[PDB]
Design a protein around this ligand. Structure first.
Ligand SMILES: O=c1[nH]c2ccccc2n2c(S)nnc12
Length: 289
């Protein structure tokens, strides 16, 4: 009767921290002085490779955890939370050198029944929606560009992007959905020729490169980038959001929970719950002084 929830490590939607020796979560508080709600999430012990605990209890919290808690109380279900084993959101890939394709990441865990519900900043798109159901979006999604403050880029149609040169370096994260999407679009091939020269192994490295003036612009999720930029006085996002969609809760097709998850989200938009989440989680009060 208890739902298996899969989520993924992605601040500020889901923070992942160790439990204490007792197996409890450290008591912490929000800017408003409310207790941070924390759940126990088991997941791959990436922090301690070599540990005899391969799958380890950890403390999860953030925007998506508050939202999970709201859903559970509103729809009266119990749950246990785990972090996706391969650390991925989910793409469809050929397996075993055949023509059979399988989803990995959280998409795969949902389809195989290792998860009953995906609660994460999971981007709604047409290909995913062929295989699962999304709720109404709890938050809107798009890409944006991270730059040093002062750098002016209008957005995706900016000439320094559309007509690239070594004078203005931009990039994204290798093997991310952004990377995979860009590399397959005829319309983006000129941009991609530039980007594949500069793509970074991880978002954190790319963000640091922008601070270090080693990368001029980083193309990534706008929620992640706006969160990161708010921490740093010398970092800003710039240009119009682009390639937009929304984040939704994911469930298997014809799930008995789908309508109720959507109604709960619509209620939360209307009553100010979602806006309160945005206030609590999404932006620093001010840049580091
Ligand atoms: O559903 C997603 N959500 C994502 C949210 C933030 C950053 C990357 C995300 N992502 C990637 S890469 N691939 N799928 C996703």
């Amino acid at each position: 009767t208890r739902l298996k929830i899969v989520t993924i490590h992605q601040e500020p939607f889901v923070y992942v921290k160790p439990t204490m020796s007792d197996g409890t979560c450290k008591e912490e508080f929000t800017v408003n002085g409310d207790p941070v709600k924390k759940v126990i999430c088991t997941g791959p012990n990436d922090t301690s490779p070599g540990s005899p605990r391969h799958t380890v209890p950890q403390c999860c919290y953030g925007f998506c955890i508050d939202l999970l808690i709201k859903l559970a109380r509103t729809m009266n279900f119990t749950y246990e939370v785990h972090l996706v084993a391969d650390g991925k959101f989910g793409t469809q890939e050929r397996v075993n050198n055949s023509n059979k394709k399988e989803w990995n990441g959280m998409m795969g865990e949902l389809l195989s029944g290792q998860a009953d519900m995906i609660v994460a900043p999971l981007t709604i798109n047409n290909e995913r929606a062929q295989y699962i159901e999304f709720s109404k979006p709890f938050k809107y999604q798009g890409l944006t560009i991270l730059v040093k403050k002062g750098t002016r880029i209008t957005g995706i149609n900016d000439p320094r992007l559309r007509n690239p040169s070594d004078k203005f370096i931009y990039a994204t994260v290798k093997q991310s959905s952004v990377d995979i999407y860009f590399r397959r679009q005829v319309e983006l091939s000129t941009m991609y020729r530039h980007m594949e020269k500069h793509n970074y192994e991880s978002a954190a490295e790319a963000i640091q490169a922008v601070r270090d003036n080693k990368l001029h612009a980083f193309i990534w999720d706008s929620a992640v980038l706006e969160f990161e930029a708010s921490q740093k006085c010398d970092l800003v996002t710039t240009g119009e959001l682009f390639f937009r969609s929304g984040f939704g809760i994911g469930m298997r097709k014809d799930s008995p929970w789908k309508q109720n998850v959507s109604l709960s989200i619509l209620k939360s938009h209307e009553n100010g719950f979602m806006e309160d989440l945005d206030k609590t989680w999404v932006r620093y009060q001010e840049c580091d002084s």
